[PDB]
Assembly symmetry: C3
Homo-oligomer: 196 residues x 3
């Protein structure tokens, strides 16, 4: 009738107050939820320093940040791929090898172990071109022929291959003169013998 | 006029209920929308491992992640800039160059084509200091003088610059001895006369 | 009763005000979280796609610098990024080797290393000076070798010089002269009565 309509009205209003009440709560936590998630992500995400994006300064503090699980970047001129310690490791091993081989070279040269002129120890004979052919050693240079000195007298026999020195030459030149002098007195005695 | 009053209220309530529903729908999609965006972002954002930020482990799984379009890092002492494939490439070209050079230095020492002592082929003469001057070759060791051996007989003529060996001097000495013999007897015969 | 209408109208009015207030605070809250999300979307580093197998930095053609990268473990198989300081260390060593290779070449040319040296373009050439032993052998796989380019050596009782074909020739030349003379002594001594 008339008081009927009014209770119906107060009834709906009551439900409305309750539904508003209820909905405030749901909306609140929904808002709070997404905010907490956004804040968590922001706290963890890696970022460009600014809108230009030409730099990322990592947030690990003065120690720095390790970045790991980096797939081997292409190693080529003009390549803009990050490289990892394993790729750097490979390079270092070849540089270490080079460093050693360089050292070995220097050592072998001084130890008389490589090259045409070698010596197997500090008391061994020095050999020259021992594993190679040819029949001539030539010691001439841009100023002409060279004297070969420090030569120890060589063996003097029928098949000796020792070089002979200035001293041994002298001994030969001494008997020659001796011969000639003795030919001189042989010739003067022949001359006096004739007079008589 | 009380009937009109009543259905002005009913109309008002009807509109409140339309509005509450309108609000439910709009907040519903507004919240979904912001949630989708965040989720999408959380799936694609690259992240630090924990709050220390001393480590990022890339999320590509066991075969890892390529990082690309990295600008050449400053290569200076204690630089903390990432370096790229191109920067490694430049260094690598130097190592190969050095490795090849090291291989070639050794090779030429063996073939005897560098240094003061050389041979331009397996039957070629052995040259000693051919491209420099001076007038002496000293073969004396810390133990004094040395015997030169393996010396093939040299040419004996008016202009020969060949080294002379022991066989050659043996032969001369024998002629000299033969002569000195003869002269002794020739001078001994002269004593009798 | 006309009084109840007043109370209803008053509640309605408060409910509408509450709706309005809820709209304001929701509009503000949604905008705020969207701003944070957009800010973050714009500035976060991202994987190219859902595989996460590549990150392409958003710097443009010029590229993006990554700095404050902690030194990566340099070890076989390591998947840590490496920095400029680490690359610089390797570069210093590579440089050292490039120099060392250069010196070696230079020093071989200048005759300053090894068993055969010459301290200057006009100095004596020395063979195995700081070393001992008493033999130099010049035989190769083709046997004994001739030593040529040998200038006349000193001829005296304590000389250590090598002798050449010319010198031997002057000796051989006196022999033939002697032999002829001993002939003209014997053809003459035989004439004795
Ligand atoms: Cl190197």
């Amino acid at each position: 009738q008339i008081e009927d309509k009014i209770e119906e009205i107060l009834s709906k209003i009551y439900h409305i107050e309750n539904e508003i009440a209820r909905i405030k709560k749901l909306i609140d936590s929904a808002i709070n939820n997404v905010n907490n998630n956004v804040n968590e992500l922001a706290n963890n995400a890696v970022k460009y320093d600014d809108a230009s994006k030409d730099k990322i300064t990592l947030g690990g503090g003065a120690t720095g940040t390790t970045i790991t699980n980096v797939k081997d970047g292409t190693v080529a001129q003009g390549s803009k791929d990050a490289v990892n310690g394993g790729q750097l490791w490979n390079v270092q091993q070849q540089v270490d090898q080079n460093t050693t081989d360089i050292s070995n070279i220097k050592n072998d040269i001084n130890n008389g172990t490589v090259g045409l002129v070698q010596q197997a120890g500090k008391d061994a004979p020095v050999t020259v071109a021992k594993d190679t052919g040819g029949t001539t050693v030539n010691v001439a240079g841009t100023d002409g022929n060279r004297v070969v000195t420090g030569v120890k007298e060589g063996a003097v026999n029928a098949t000796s291959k020792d070089a002979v020195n200035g001293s041994q030459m002298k001994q030969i030149e001494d008997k020659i003169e001796e011969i000639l002098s003795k030919i001189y007195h042989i010739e003067n005695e022949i001359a006096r013998i004739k007079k008589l």
